[PDB]
Structure 1
């Protein structure tokens, strides 16, 4: 079965959300696209990026290093398409702004705009966690920007409940 997402709550006609680990979702659903919360040099050193790379037994990092050698780094708000390995057909590496490192929160709209080149995506909440953006604001930018079908996996029941309550106000 293709893009077999289960147990999501539909927020809008094209945005769905689940309290789930994106790694486990990717292994079970086998989506056409999984989004990585990347940095500009595609160094998957921790957080969501480190977990997705570890689930590929480091194949994503080796492929990423070869992409950067030939193409140079990404820009904040930009993306590239690489292999999905065992997690998806493709991985869309998207760089959201890291507010904790002084990058502009306005680039979060440009980051979500990359999703619109793909019909269906499994994604994390961009710039949340240690990237420092307000997660309620990241969900609002996602809903306002993405026009294709996005399935957000947020691996924290406390944050999931706060996001659904924020959306339903």
Structure 2
């Protein structure tokens, strides 16, 4: 039993809700919140910009030190950093950015990072400003993630379409 509330159950391990991931994280304080990161951990917009703003830029400060030490992530890769005031940990996961020409096949590799964590609050990878089809992202999530994932979908209109078309 966990403290996630109001989710629709899609499969044995995948749950979905119309919610602002920032507000969800502040309420639940989950062990792991997933950020929709880029390889530079430049949290300028989308989910990443919103999560960073909620940390008063502390996420960006930590991220800049991480990059200065380690260099960029790989598309499809991830790193675990602090969750600041939002979660115990933040799993920064890089889905492919379609608006950069990146190979959508890497979306499965990106979701595989979730399997290293027993429970996660997460957005749909590569959705929004990363340019992928969210229906496809949800399908890849369900077919790749085996741990317990709670998906926050900000757009109410998009949430209803994902549920109604879910196979």
Shift of 1:29: 0.4
After the TM superposition, list the runs of 4 or more consecutive aligned residues in structure 1 that deviate by more than 2 angstroms: none
Give me the whole-angstrom Cα distance separating, in 1, the residues matched to 2:129 and 2:108. 18
2: CA distance between counterparts of 1:120 and 1:109? 18
- 2: CA distance, partners of 1:42 / 1:150: 22
Cα offset, 1:132, TM superposition: 0.8
- 1:53-109: CA deviation from partner (whole Å, max 9, x where unpaired): 011101000000000011000000000000000100000000000011100000000
Q: What are the equivalent positions in structure 2 for 1:16-165 lying under 5 Å apart? A: 16-165=15-164
Q: Is the 8 A contact 1:98 1:131 kept in 2?
A: yes
Is 1:33–1:121's contact at 8 Å kept on the other side of the alignment?
A: yes
How many residue pairs were aligned?
Answer: 167
Q: Any unmatched runs of 5+ in structure 1?
A: none
Shift of 1:47: 1.1
- 1:97·1:107 contact (CA, 8 Å) conserved in 2? yes
Between the aligned partners of 2:64 and 2:99, the Cα distance in structure 1 is 25
Q: Is there any run of 5+ residues in structure 2 with no aligned partner, and where?
A: none
Cα offsets for 1:15-68 (capped at 9, x unmatched): 000000000000000000000000000000111101100111010000000000
Shift of 1:157: 1.0
How many angstroms does 1:3 deviate by? 4.5
Q: Is the 8 A contact 1:37 1:95 kept in 2?
A: yes
TM-score (norm 1): 0.97
Q: What CA distance in whole angstroms lies between the structure 2 residues aligned with 1:139 and 1:13? A: 14
Q: Contact between 1:36 and 1:92, CA under 8 Å: does it hold in 2?
A: yes
Per-residue deviation at 1:4? 1.3
**TM-score where L is the length of structure 2:** 0.98
Q: In the aligned structure 2, how far is the partner of 1:159 from the partner of 1:102?
A: 23
**3-state SS of paired residue (2:10):** strand
